[PDB]
């Protein structure tokens, strides 16, 4: 048939039955039908209306679900620490110095009748294929993720058993997917006011609970074969056709962080933990990944809580409540990396803060057409 | 550090009820013998026999509830709330009251030897009425916190009951009050009257006809030596409890092991009156 | 549910038990044989209690003949058959029951001598001559046929340890409790009630000189009961461990077994005190 | 080679030390106040050796008037500052030395009492009145100026413990050495020489009753030396632990230190005896 | 079948052994020097027991004069040589055998003193003067000849343990068992049998006062055997686990060695008892 590009917004289908999922989206019947077509079409991950619609819906969900209180307008030892360490359960390790949440929500975009969502099924798709041979038609898409974070990506469903790098053709913005074979997962736990067996305040057999003196200290521990995944990422970067550096030398590639004085979103672990938004320091994590000798190489990161954040989509800041009392736990699967790669004499991978590029990765192969 | 873990050693759980059983047996035998030879046959001659009779009756109401503590030290308390309310109130009234008569005997002896001439009526007055109006009813006045704060608790398949205060500040101030009633105020009282009677007997070396005070000072010193490690123990527990000294879990556990041990060796003050009557000195 | 968790290590027990056994054995055989060949052979006896105390010494002499078998079982894996094991257990149990039965008998003689001091002298003669054997000996032989039938040597991983083997745990409970009654409590109320009422009868006397011979008997009674009390308390604790009451302590049951062996050796001192009390007054 | 590794955190040591300190402090106040009131103020004294008992009680009272700071140091770490630490170390040294020298003086006084019973009455009062001060009191202050300069507090991990500190181990071992000779060696042969001389000259009497006055002096000297000797041999072994002889045990070294603390606790019973041999006769 | 499993710490033994060694050394040299100075030079002897008590004290003096070498070997390692090791071993063996033989001589002297009191007075003098030296000293020197050859110190890695080294183990077992024989089997039978005849013939006396000075000899014998018998049952038990009768307890063998050392130190207190028994009566 004959199809044309259209800018008509779609309707979302979800399985979660929360307030935003029921109000803004339809229930999902898992009608994932895919028809392969022997046609050639142009697909762009960044110049896509479905990616912008998903970013706007994610921002609307983030605004409506976790309501901030104030909305602002511009007017040498290597100590690998697991979850069973003695300092872990008491929350007293050597950390950083002092400076309603939505649940498991995942949706799909279903096209209206008279419309289709052509999907590029190319294996070498780097986010921009002007001539994609494998075009697959689908009325309803696959099952995307609404988690918002910098430096990484969690609970994504596009983490295949390989590494592929999305590269924008006009700048150095890069999206890198992870390998699911290495089982790359993280664990984060904040111990709160630790209590004892009940009060027992008496003449004999008297106890004392351990109140957490640092509510602004949390610890995420990071698991998986990350040296092998780091080598796979460097090999895919050296094998990328847009790589201007030395393709036969992966040692000229070096992972990096943004310098001090920049935004805290691009320099720290701007991620959510059950309504409380962490700010961790991956300097020890960067020393562990890059094997920088003579420095502190840890498999964890001291996380600092912050009542204020910055708006990733719009211009402004959001101020939230003080953190509640109790134990805070988070668990997800690391699926993608958001970073900027500069090519030269020494290739530098600077971690970016483009939260929208995760959803641009998730909906980049799909493209709405009008039948 | 996770928490504070409470655990009693198994050697206390077998040696300790052995101690309560032997203390119970000799206490009930000796106090029943003393009561049935004094308060029923009227064999009283001196004035201290009424005081030691009061000590013996408070003793026997302690011993008649002692096997409840003996079965508490090995097994869970499956009697009821009111039963251990009763055992707690009778324990504190015995422990306070015995201190009051054990100071009253020294007060009578101070009024006897120093004021030998002009004291015939008032020694008889404390023999009849002043002990009843100033020993038992103050001791009964110091039971109503136990009458309001003692309760039972189920802490992990183990029924224990204790005077359960709302917070640790109540516990630390009540252990402090336990010192200032058990040791301190009768201590300076008994040291003052014994220093005065010794300094006056040093002026009275001309006669040695009255030597019945040797049993009194022997009872005083043995009572204080029996109760001193317990008071030092609860003072150490009081000092760690108000976080003036911090050492960790092992110090509190060592303190609890030692404090049950000096409960065992400080319950020996029951069999002090009958052995001293069996020796006459 | 751990069934046994049997810990039979007992390193310090295997040295402390034979030392106490050899001390008690040597002093028992020397003192008991010596006191038999001065009391019974020479007919040197003058009082009334000396016949019962002679019965105590012959029973404890029979005990300390077979005590080295207990020592060599305690330190070593013993090989002397089943007839000898039956003999050892039967003579140990007839001694253990005859001691408390003649203790009740001599307390009854003291009661009948003090209270009925005028019109009862031939009852003392028939008590010490005719009805004494039917009083202690043949009941003590009557409570030993289960020991005659239940003493057998086990077939172990080479131990060959001989112990009194019973059908089931309820049989252990009822027999061990029967030992508790007929070894502690019924002679306990008999002796203690008779001594209490002769103390109450002694208040009617004018401080007479009939208590000068009472001190040796009462200190023998008191030392005997203090010697046998912790072993019986450990027996009661082990019996309450059965019927699944304080069943949480498997290693506490192991330390109860170690403790009951220790106070078993310590409670074997009821043969030493008789010739020592003969040596003193 | 690990020098000390002093990280052991003993607990029963830290519980048994303050109760021993408290009971010896309490009996120090009681007995020493009684004996100071009946010797120094009433002037009841009838002999010559009671002046030495008087002065020894003054030294022991100087010890036990501030012994609770030793008790608090046993409980927790020092908070009172360096001046009180200096004061308690110098009073500990003058009491420790001066008690041994006045025992030497009273043994010398008994020597001229027994041997030169006829021609020595003016050196008797000369030893009792004048030369006793310049013999025992001030020379003990000549052995405390290095203690006066060398005692301070430490800058530890929020502890500030109170102990004597030295720039080298040589000063440590020679001061432990001088403690050994001053406490045992030359006063010990003084006591031994005078005592064998008077026990050789005692046998010439035809059953005289002057021996009964010697018995109090000999039981006081024997109790003092038997009370002080285990700490002396512990500190001698600890001095031999240094100086490159017996380096094979570090855990042996810390158990030697624990034995030093236990024996230092137990060796303060020389503050107990002087009233006790006056209470008994 | 593990051969040795040799221990390496011996922690509390290395500090507890020199303390009791110095206690027994000091009290031995003081008491034995005083008793020799009164009754071997000044001649205060009147009875016949005191001659053997003097000879026991002089063998005691040669033992305590070398007990500091035992203290040095307890806390440290041998630095002296081979001749001094030979000397301390021979003098320890003659002291050990001579004490047992001379207490048997005390028993025989009491036997002829009480039984043959009318016809044995000249062989009493003969046994007091002449044949006593042949009786006690000559078998001791004839028995220490295997010690006199077998006393060598081996060049151990750092310790150089002075021990009786043997070519094999059957000789060790048979020498331990003959040591047990000479320690107990003949002389204990002699002592207990003779005292049995003394008590048997003493009942023929109508309350005579001839047994007043005999109780000190009985308490001497009982005290000596009371200290010596735990060490004797320790070496007997070591011989029993040797010769492959008990095999499972190599840790129990280490416990046996620790017990043997500790009660060897405690059994060396037979030096203490003769001077304090002369101090009392």
mmCIF file of C-alpha atoms in Angstrom, chain B residues 7 10-11 13-15 17-18 21-22 25-26 29 32-33 36-37 41 43 71 74-76 78 157-158 278, chain C residues 192 196 199-200 202-207 211 225-226 229-230 233-234 237 240 245-246 248 251-252 255-256 259:
data_model
loop_
_atom_site.group_PDB
_atom_site.id
_atom_site.type_symbol
_atom_site.label_atom_id
_atom_site.label_comp_id
_atom_site.label_asym_id
_atom_site.label_seq_id
_atom_site.Cartn_x
_atom_site.Cartn_y
_atom_site.Cartn_z
ATOM 1 C CA UNK B 7 21.162 -14.089 76.093
ATOM 2 C CA UNK B 10 23.414 -22.141 80.358
ATOM 3 C CA UNK B 11 25.616 -22.474 83.452
ATOM 4 C CA UNK B 13 20.311 -21.802 84.178
ATOM 5 C CA UNK B 14 21.289 -24.840 86.305
ATOM 6 C CA UNK B 15 23.553 -23.465 89.066
ATOM 7 C CA UNK B 17 17.956 -22.755 90.548
ATOM 8 C CA UNK B 18 20.220 -24.930 92.708
ATOM 9 C CA UNK B 21 16.359 -24.290 96.129
ATOM 10 C CA UNK B 22 18.994 -24.453 98.883
ATOM 11 C CA UNK B 25 15.001 -24.890 102.053
ATOM 12 C CA UNK B 26 17.199 -23.392 104.775
ATOM 13 C CA UNK B 29 13.254 -24.160 107.903
ATOM 14 C CA UNK B 32 9.656 -21.303 110.596
ATOM 15 C CA UNK B 33 11.737 -22.524 113.542
ATOM 16 C CA UNK B 36 7.387 -20.970 116.023
ATOM 17 C CA UNK B 37 9.907 -20.650 118.874
ATOM 18 C CA UNK B 41 5.939 -19.879 122.590
ATOM 19 C CA UNK B 43 10.454 -17.001 124.444
ATOM 20 C CA UNK B 71 11.007 -21.983 88.294
ATOM 21 C CA UNK B 74 14.725 -22.217 84.189
ATOM 22 C CA UNK B 75 11.269 -22.161 82.536
ATOM 23 C CA UNK B 76 8.879 -19.565 81.143
ATOM 24 C CA UNK B 78 3.113 -19.672 82.731
ATOM 25 C CA UNK B 157 8.782 -17.945 72.966
ATOM 26 C CA UNK B 158 9.900 -16.921 76.450
ATOM 27 C CA UNK B 278 21.884 -21.405 115.836
ATOM 28 C CA UNK C 192 11.959 -31.777 109.303
ATOM 29 C CA UNK C 196 10.467 -28.767 114.212
ATOM 30 C CA UNK C 199 12.345 -27.658 118.773
ATOM 31 C CA UNK C 200 8.876 -26.414 119.754
ATOM 32 C CA UNK C 202 12.305 -27.675 123.711
ATOM 33 C CA UNK C 203 10.816 -24.215 124.331
ATOM 34 C CA UNK C 204 8.830 -25.705 127.224
ATOM 35 C CA UNK C 205 12.092 -26.898 128.791
ATOM 36 C CA UNK C 206 14.061 -24.526 131.021
ATOM 37 C CA UNK C 207 17.131 -24.496 128.770
ATOM 38 C CA UNK C 211 20.406 -30.588 123.465
ATOM 39 C CA UNK C 225 20.923 -32.884 102.938
ATOM 40 C CA UNK C 226 23.311 -30.196 101.674
ATOM 41 C CA UNK C 229 20.513 -31.430 97.420
ATOM 42 C CA UNK C 230 22.200 -30.198 94.165
ATOM 43 C CA UNK C 233 17.935 -30.571 91.863
ATOM 44 C CA UNK C 234 19.848 -31.573 88.728
ATOM 45 C CA UNK C 237 15.893 -30.406 86.046
ATOM 46 C CA UNK C 240 11.597 -31.619 83.562
ATOM 47 C CA UNK C 245 8.885 -28.850 78.483
ATOM 48 C CA UNK C 246 12.216 -26.980 78.307
ATOM 49 C CA UNK C 248 14.875 -26.048 73.423
ATOM 50 C CA UNK C 251 23.316 -28.397 74.375
ATOM 51 C CA UNK C 252 21.803 -27.210 77.657
ATOM 52 C CA UNK C 255 25.695 -29.369 80.034
ATOM 53 C CA UNK C 256 23.016 -30.699 82.418
ATOM 54 C CA UNK C 259 26.736 -30.963 85.628
#
